[PDB]
Amino acid sequence: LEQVHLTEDGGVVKTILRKGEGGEENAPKKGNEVTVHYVGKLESSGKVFDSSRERNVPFKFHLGQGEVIKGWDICVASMTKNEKCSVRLDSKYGYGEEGCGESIPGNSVLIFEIELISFRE
Amino acid sequence: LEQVHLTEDGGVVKTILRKGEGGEENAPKKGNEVTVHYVGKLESSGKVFDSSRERNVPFKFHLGQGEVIKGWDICVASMTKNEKCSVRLDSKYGYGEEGCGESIPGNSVLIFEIELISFRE
């Protein structure tokens, strides 16, 4: 599968696993509420640190507003409705030098599988 | 004002600044999407690290589903519609021993002002 580099530093790299729907009406815009399912793991250890599929609750956030890590705002902005991808985030687009909480060390590369289910204004 | 200890360890202590609405229909239930405004600062320095009021975008999450730090799930579950509070979170209910990113050191106590605006199923 082709890998799309979403930044020029190779820090956000998306591989589409399931093509979403075409047409502009199926692409989200800044500010829209997007609804996604995701699973995140560390590249180094392969250990999953979080998943919306675990509780079976689609996760919602406002696109491009900094409610989530930078790599997500970049990756989800490139997706269309029903698209499923895997995206590889350098720490710069994740939790940086310090990491976050018990499961994410400083300087960790993150891999997420993200499905864009729907979005609205 | 009364300080309500929402856990027996004193780790989540909520002070109600503005009483919300009474009635069972005005208190959220587990799983409900809650819409809040919040301002979070470090207790030690009083430095604000994150605020939905900044972007003026009310923040939404699904209550009790582990989408947010534990202290928020506990605090918001105790609130009613239109309630505004200040809650003190020990690090156990925040970002723990490791902290998170640049702005939240390990072992930080957090203070959030949280307003419950509305909720729905």
Binding site: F61, Y95, C100, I104 | D50, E67, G101
Partner: peptide
């Protein structure tokens, strides 16, 4: 600072 989400998700983690």
């Amino acid at each position: 600072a989400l998700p983690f």
